[PDB]
Symmetry: D2
Subunit: 481 residues, 4 copies
Amino acid sequence: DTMKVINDPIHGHIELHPLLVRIIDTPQFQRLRYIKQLGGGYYVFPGASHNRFEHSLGVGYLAGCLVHALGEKQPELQISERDVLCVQIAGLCRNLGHGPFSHMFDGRFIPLARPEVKWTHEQGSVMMFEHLINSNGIKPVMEQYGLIPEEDICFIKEQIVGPLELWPYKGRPENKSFLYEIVSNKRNGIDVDKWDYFARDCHHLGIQNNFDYKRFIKFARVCEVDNELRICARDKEVGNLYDMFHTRNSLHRRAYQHKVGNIIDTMITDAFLKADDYIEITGAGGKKYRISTAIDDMEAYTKLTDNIFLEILYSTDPKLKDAREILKQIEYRNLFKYVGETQPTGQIKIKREDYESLPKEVASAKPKVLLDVKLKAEDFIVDVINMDYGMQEKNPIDHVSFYCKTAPNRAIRITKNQVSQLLPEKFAEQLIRVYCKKVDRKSLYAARQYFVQWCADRNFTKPQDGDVIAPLITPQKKEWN
Amino acid sequence: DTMKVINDPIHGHIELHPLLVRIIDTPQFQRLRYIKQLGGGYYVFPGASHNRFEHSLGVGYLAGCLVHALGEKQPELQISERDVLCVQIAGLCRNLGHGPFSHMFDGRFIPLARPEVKWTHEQGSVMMFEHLINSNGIKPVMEQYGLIPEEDICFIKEQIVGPLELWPYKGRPENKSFLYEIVSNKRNGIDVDKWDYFARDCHHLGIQNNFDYKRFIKFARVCEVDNELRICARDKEVGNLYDMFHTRNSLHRRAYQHKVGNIIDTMITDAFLKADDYIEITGAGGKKYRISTAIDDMEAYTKLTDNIFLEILYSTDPKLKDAREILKQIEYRNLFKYVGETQPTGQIKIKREDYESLPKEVASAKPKVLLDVKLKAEDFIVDVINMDYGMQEKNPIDHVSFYCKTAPNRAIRITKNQVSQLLPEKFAEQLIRVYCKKVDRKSLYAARQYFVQWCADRNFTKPQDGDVIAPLITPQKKEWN
Amino acid sequence: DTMKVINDPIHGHIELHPLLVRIIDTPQFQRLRYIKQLGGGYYVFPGASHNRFEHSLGVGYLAGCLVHALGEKQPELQISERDVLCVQIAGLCRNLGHGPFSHMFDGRFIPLARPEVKWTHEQGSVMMFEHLINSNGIKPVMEQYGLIPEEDICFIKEQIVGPLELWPYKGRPENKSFLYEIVSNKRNGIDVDKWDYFARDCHHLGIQNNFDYKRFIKFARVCEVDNELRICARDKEVGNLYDMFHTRNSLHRRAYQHKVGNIIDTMITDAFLKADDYIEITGAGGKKYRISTAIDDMEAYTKLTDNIFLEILYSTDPKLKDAREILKQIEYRNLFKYVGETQPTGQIKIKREDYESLPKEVASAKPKVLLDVKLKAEDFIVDVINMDYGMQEKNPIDHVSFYCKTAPNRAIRITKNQVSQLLPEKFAEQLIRVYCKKVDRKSLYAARQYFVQWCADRNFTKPQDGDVIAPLITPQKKEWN
Amino acid sequence: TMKVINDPIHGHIELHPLLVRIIDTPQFQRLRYIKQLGGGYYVFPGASHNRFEHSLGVGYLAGCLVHALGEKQPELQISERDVLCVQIAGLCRNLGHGPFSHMFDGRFIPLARPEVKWTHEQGSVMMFEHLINSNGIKPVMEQYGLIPEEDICFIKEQIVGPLELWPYKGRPENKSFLYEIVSNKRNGIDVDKWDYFARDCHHLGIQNNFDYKRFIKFARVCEVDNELRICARDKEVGNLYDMFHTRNSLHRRAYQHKVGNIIDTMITDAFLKADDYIEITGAGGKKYRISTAIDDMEAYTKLTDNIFLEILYSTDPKLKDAREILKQIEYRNLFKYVGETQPTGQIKIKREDYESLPKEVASAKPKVLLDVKLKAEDFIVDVINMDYGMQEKNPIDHVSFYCKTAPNRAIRITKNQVSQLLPEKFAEQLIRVYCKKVDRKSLYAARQYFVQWCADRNFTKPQDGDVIAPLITPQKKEWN
Ligand SMILES: O=c1ccn([C@H]2C[C@H](O)[C@@H](COP(=O)(O)OP(=O)(O)OP(=O)(O)O)O2)c(=O)[nH]1
Ligand SMILES: O=c1ccn([C@H]2C[C@H](O)[C@@H](COP(=O)(O)OP(=O)(O)OP(=O)(O)O)O2)c(=O)[nH]1
Ligand SMILES: O=c1ccn([C@H]2C[C@H](O)[C@@H](COP(=O)(O)OP(=O)(O)OP(=O)(O)O)O2)c(=O)[nH]1
Ligand SMILES: O=c1ccn([C@H]2C[C@H](O)[C@@H](COP(=O)(O)OP(=O)(O)OP(=O)(O)O)O2)c(=O)[nH]1
Ligand SMILES: [Mg+2]
Ligand SMILES: [Mg+2]
Ligand SMILES: [Mg+2]
Ligand SMILES: [Mg+2]
Ligand SMILES: [Mg+2]
Ligand SMILES: [Mg+2]
Ligand SMILES: [Mg+2]
């Protein structure tokens, strides 16, 4: 059993250690071939056909590169081949828990189908990894390559989902803390997962990013902070780190939160909810599950992928008619109509409990205009998107350590006004999109009136095309000229 | 309504006339989102997740570009917007007939399952297009934008499949003959389908494209040739044209005919053959069809995509067990073993009717090696591959017309001797790959002995690793020494 | 005289009209092959070997593309072939006036060698262009192609530098106002010049470009604004527009204002100063000129290129001993040492009239630490960089007109709060870099103490490595630590 | 300390301080002023890259290959000293290039110094010696664990071959594979090629189809004929053929572009007419000509593309002629391409026949009525040898391969074992004819002369033959 080489368009020829090969050649890993990275985004960007599989290969590769580079530059860290392999496996397996259409499933479907439970794709990754190991005889292969199953499996899980419950990690001591910053960085969000999806998503979407992860790896060091060994960036790179997050935000603005892509994720979520009772997925022993309950049994979850979209589309049963028809609306491109975008003002934000009261509000506005129809709450969709730098209101660069050329072992901090005045003032904000399920001319005119009026009543930002879609409405708001 | 813009990672922003949008937004066309361009190639090249949908868009785009450029450079040709639109539609629609995993379906599955039928994906494209037209109310929409459905539908079909039966075409007169050279070039095979797949497949496989189609388009012109108007190329580009085909060959050698990709297509085909008596696909009138019979009913064929792979894989029915098992062999990477490659020598050419008897020849070989395993004919797979420049044994550049700078309307011919002595001396050859369905070490050893002996017996070429995998066989053959 | 095609790595195959061909093949234009786009940047980024020549080709090409797109989308604008050609000529010729090492010349050398005159590369471009036209008999070729030299030459120069002085233009009337927005946009800075250098500089530097100019071109219209027919962008694009400026900023930060690249431009500049009495360039009639004076005779300026750097370098004349030695220090990489970067705080704005006072202040600072060596004013360099969005303190997007899909001919305005709260609050800032000419250790320590103390006294931002380069000085400033 | 350089081709490359010290010398920095493709820049405007960045690239790739070999196979005993020597060799193998690169050693020198045997290789060795001596590199080398006597010899041998049975001195036979990296005299597969494939493609606007990273990943060292040599994996053989095919393509499209070559020729002519009058100052203040600068490394250090601009800008009337040719380049008044043909049969044209060629063309007697009579000073005949790097031989016959099943056993693979669609021949010649007189009538004449000549010598029919000379072509029965 030898290394295999895989050719990836992003990273080139990637070498895979035989243990990694063993992990990859399982139903649990191969499942990721049938889950689109960007979910419904493929229906807007036809280049975005990539799946979580190739992305995961990429993450394992980059984890390997960063750990090896650190060990190579700093022998005093005593990074072992075992550490390298463990970081590699963590990188390969942190996407194991994604469901159909990726972030649609944990972001939209699950919270609606099962409001009581709090599921994340990370927990799904830990559970799925445990099921892969246990179902495929991986433990003895691990020990066969000088890994210690007990400690190392724990380590892998921890890298993926953080502490399983003062130094909180049991997989590795403080003197190897930096290993936990590579795959999924809880501290500042700077990790190789972001790097792979930046490059890969850009390559498939046909839009480009200027973040250079290779450069970052070149200047990465391990230095001591707060009695921990942590990864530090070279000082002169601070400007680039800021740009990194800018790139993230840009990618969210252009692709990941494209209004139509989001409405397609919403319509698919909708079809999944109408189908949940009727689609049977066989789990362990023979117990049958639903889409919403498959997350309870990894055997059933292994068979839960993008495929059910087509399963719903191709079905003939009356019980699935309503599900089916929605999907067909997607095929005919009869999508819900986008009405518009606005934002709250001040330090006023919309929290999660108010999300379902919003269609009603939009429907409750009184545009002093004569309409041919009346719309009700059920006719509107209100989608609230949080855009941030990955730590709510915080600046993540406040949580990065730097080192300078004159004392490369000394960690320091760099504040925002040590860098530039042209940087953002805040680091979190909310976008509000409104869509109408009635797609005829009249109803959409009406919808625009209700919408702009609702914006005026709540002192939100003036829609960019406000003066065009509601000329009778905008003048009442003097703050809009 | 109005035109749309699509961002494609290969061509950038592609503009779509609303009629094209109407054609694309149908089940018949959207179907192509669920058919991988390279079929089983994705299982070897993880970047190759692209489907026939995006490829089809790219082809329609390029057909548009070429006809437009011709029109702009030579107004005397009288190309109308109607012509442009019909060529764009043909470009968009020549891929409509592809089945699950593309060339696996018409190259491997149909020939085995329905050997009495002479099916091609092109015919499939014509029937599927007829069904899209009729099921989606397209004719009046065509009339609305200035097209004449009778004639123009004829024209499109002819561009896809050739004459539906001296001028054999009824969709356009001889003075527009060059328009038939764009989408699917029956004369020499230089068309825009190739250009799109060169660039897109290369972009996704992580292999770099050598061919510059924009350059070609800039130096394309129409000239009179044998009382016919044809697309001719600038003389200086003749080398480039040769390189084009070289590229095609290279792509076939590295990717499209990859030994493992091919064995994967073969295993999927085997599974389909074993699932064929059980999978039912509802056609028109609620009539039932099989995977093998879907091609007789466009309503059923519409529902026949890559999804069946998963339908088979997730099935619980005992009667599907076998098929299911084969697919599971794929997930665990327990694939049929590659034994070797050889070629015929002299002027021996393997006939299509001789294919079936080949594993029997191999099993009946008598290698002088001691073996603890005897293999039967049914243990061997023999895959015969015809590699050519697209016109069997002919040089396609002998079917290209050129023009000179000084006389831009005088068509000429250029022979291979006028170009280089470093070019191929033949334009077709056969590659014979042998595989073994028994994957154990002993079986693979024995299979290697049989294979090399069979090569010796038939005076085929010495396998590249012959001296290594069969050191006791290769000495007997003096022509190899 | 027919069309030529040029292959360019950025744009691919550029078609050049015979008139542009005749303009390009002159000494005046070919001169640009010998002037590096990024001056001293090549000494830091080895891929940046590109010259002003190819950039000029790119700019001309894109100007052509934009005017052409505008014309095909809106025939009512009556754009003529004349217009296309003049916009192309302006695009081709707007870089004609650059001098040795590009921005080094008009940005450092001329302002120091000739404080009394106000000169810029744009004026250089108009003068050079006039010279080209008259020395090469271009007017009759222009007339041969249907141009009208009187108004068209004016139109071209106007596009390059603006009004030569109510509507202030002679070349074209108000209903063609948008044509003045293409090559050099004096209203908001969005023009094709920027687009070409984004793409080209990124290609050569090894940094990736994230601005998509083809998308912009595709979404651009012409609308009525304040009695003028201006170019408007789709509302949707607003985010991207902001990103466009961000990119510009990033490119300045990473490459164009690189500390070492700037110090190299400085050393080259003062070498030119040392050589300014002693080098002779033969001008019109046979007169002699200096490097600082070739600016006054176009025939002399034609021979002023990067070549001069080598003249000095290769010289043996004792009169040039000083200059020469400096260039040699660049060859051995014995450069002035960088000691730090800081910014002003509050409302403080370092004026040009004060630059000269800066090295004296640093030498005047009294650090309060043990120094082995004293440094004087001559030992310091202070470089002041003005970073902005190209309109000083103003937001350029406030000066951009938009349109919505609902009523495409209806120009509108978009404000910053209508886009994002994560945007810059300020659109201009200043960076202050300090270097020391004395390069030994002790000198460097000294320079660091002086510098940090100076930042402390001037109430400037605390240097990033401040606690490391001068620990004994930093705790005296309460706002800092 | 170490330095990081951002290259558009390879990304962020790390240079050891020793390499930095070698690089920060006038002898090395000189390469910033010499264009990789010379006159090619006047046809492909993206092709502005110089030898400096290419040299960095070659150094980097040499380091990559030797390091990969070392990591996969510890038993080879590759030391950091070996690594450094191979890097230095890659970094320095382009040091001997003159103005406009291959124009200088390919066109100028053979016409100006026909008695000398000169290669950019020899110049690289001499320039390396001079660089080492003029900058005190030896003690820096010793400082980083190098042994100057052995190692300098090793580097020179890597660049130019043996200096004159194991013919090498810098390293023994068990390190033979080290000699296959920077300049492979055995089959021509080396990192120099790989770098220029990628860089030239990047700047030309043509896409490279050879994947050298894949090659590096698959390369191993195996024992072959009592040497340890680099071996490629068997199944890569196709790709190897493609590599040479790629080389040929690049020559067809760019390096041997008709107009690119005529521009190189015009520049050469200008240098020839300038050579008696340009003065370069070398050691001891002594003076040298362009054609003699190669005899003194101090003066060669100052010999770059700048010469072009020194000639164009000159005011000295002695340099008038020279200056006027370059000016015609600026006005795009170039010698006119009349056509391309090829020898048939076993006929092969040798260098010593070259100068006789314009004479034969002017002596041909086209049976058409003309207006001007052309002479043998109005014609230019350029002869191009296109091959796979080893004249008539197949370089793949000089590659060692290994198989997955026995990775330490080297094997050979023949052409017939790979494909019948491969070339039957591995070398050929292209004959281009240009005319120095650019009027329509002289051009028509030149065409008639050219085709008549092609017929007389039984050469191949020019591609535009029927068009540029409809009265000449139907005579030659073999073209019909
Ligand atoms: O010319 C090629 C051939 C293959 N690949 C890719 C496909 C795959 O992702 C990786 C490895 O395939 P390869 O053919 O090298 O390995 P293999 O099929 O498993 O052969 P073997 O087991 O004999 O090493 O390289 C390329 O990029 N270029
Ligand atoms: O910043 C962006 C936004 C979108 N796209 C792509 C996505 C899509 O393939 C195409 C068009 O999307 P767009 O957002 O422009 O169209 P739309 O969503 O239909 O908006 P509208 O109907 O209002 O024009 O361009 C980009 O490349 N970059
Ligand atoms: O295979 C090629 C050949 C040329 N070029 C470039 C070189 C140049 O930048 C442009 C045009 O050169 P071309 O050879 O096509 O024109 P020409 O030399 O002037 O020949 P002719 O006058 O017969 O058209 O195309 C390529 O990119 N690829
Ligand atoms: O954001 C950047 C900055 C620089 N470079 C390039 C330029 C150069 O080729 C190489 C190294 O430059 P750098 O600025 O990192 O090194 P330096 O100027 O020598 O700084 P220092 O000596 O303090 O490490 O990286 C980039 O690619 N991106
Ligand atoms: Mg394998
Ligand atoms: Mg994350
Ligand atoms: Mg839309
Ligand atoms: Mg075809
Ligand atoms: Mg030409
Ligand atoms: Mg430095
Ligand atoms: Mg060589």
